[PDB]
């Protein structure tokens, strides 16, 4: 926490993380490259169930590595279930990873293809009581990943783009209520799924990854605003918050299953 020094620079980036977080070379690390020809269709997978109609956002925060739109998860609202999941998972926050250029930015790749960005909607398994206890369990979290490509703008993302001006640097936060995450979902819920981990330190292996096949389109201007954010705090040398993505990690002993 208070003494972490990892980041995405040349001296503290992904290839350095293993020194302070040995699990970086673990057996179920994320992200991974999704080889579409080797992912096997699994007819037993159930349709994914995303129920965000009662989601209630609270705030948006620049934490030095990305910006998180946080939700009030004190009640049974905004749940992800079905798909490969057993039980119900509650939405706590979402954030993105993006590049310095449209040609890169996503964490997961598809047949080695890198998207301009990737949205992560983070949920914790309610059987563990809260997020803190859930991250210590192999099936503690379910993260819904959605790729972003540059093209037509995503109307639903604009409130996010506009508030970024108020949280330019590390540690800044701004009230951000009534933001509807359903505005960030593609039409189809077809997905790939596999067991993995948090993609940033502590890199805990507590995530069931659900990655949607259909990317959403955002405009060049929308992602350009993401790139104006800073990794640094106010009054420190300006380092643009870009390329805050971890590269694909060894699949090792895992199978990626397709819902289609
Ligand atoms: N991109 S991703 O894979 O979608 C991703 C999503 C959420 C996260 N969230 C976190 O990393 C939040 N931290 C909060 C602090 N946690 C610590 C901790 C908790 C309480 C007090 C002090 C530290 C933690 C470390 C080790 C075990 C359990 C908790 C680790 C998880 C990271 C990556
Ligand atoms: Zn993430």
UniProtKB/Swiss-Prot annotation:
Changing residue 68 to L: Reduced activity. Its cofactor is Zn(2+); Co(2+). Activated by X-ray, histamine, L-adrenaline, L- and D-phenylalanine, L- and D-histidine, L-His-OMe and beta-Ala-His (carnosine). The modification N-acetylserine is found at residue 3. Changing residue 145 to R: In OPTB3; complete loss of activity. GO terms for cellular component: apical part of cell; cytoplasm; cytosol; extracellular exosome; myelin sheath; plasma membrane. Its EC number is 4.2.1.1, 4.2.1.69. Changing residue 143 to H: Impaired activity. This is Carbonic anhydrase 2. It comes from Homo sapiens. The gene is CA2.
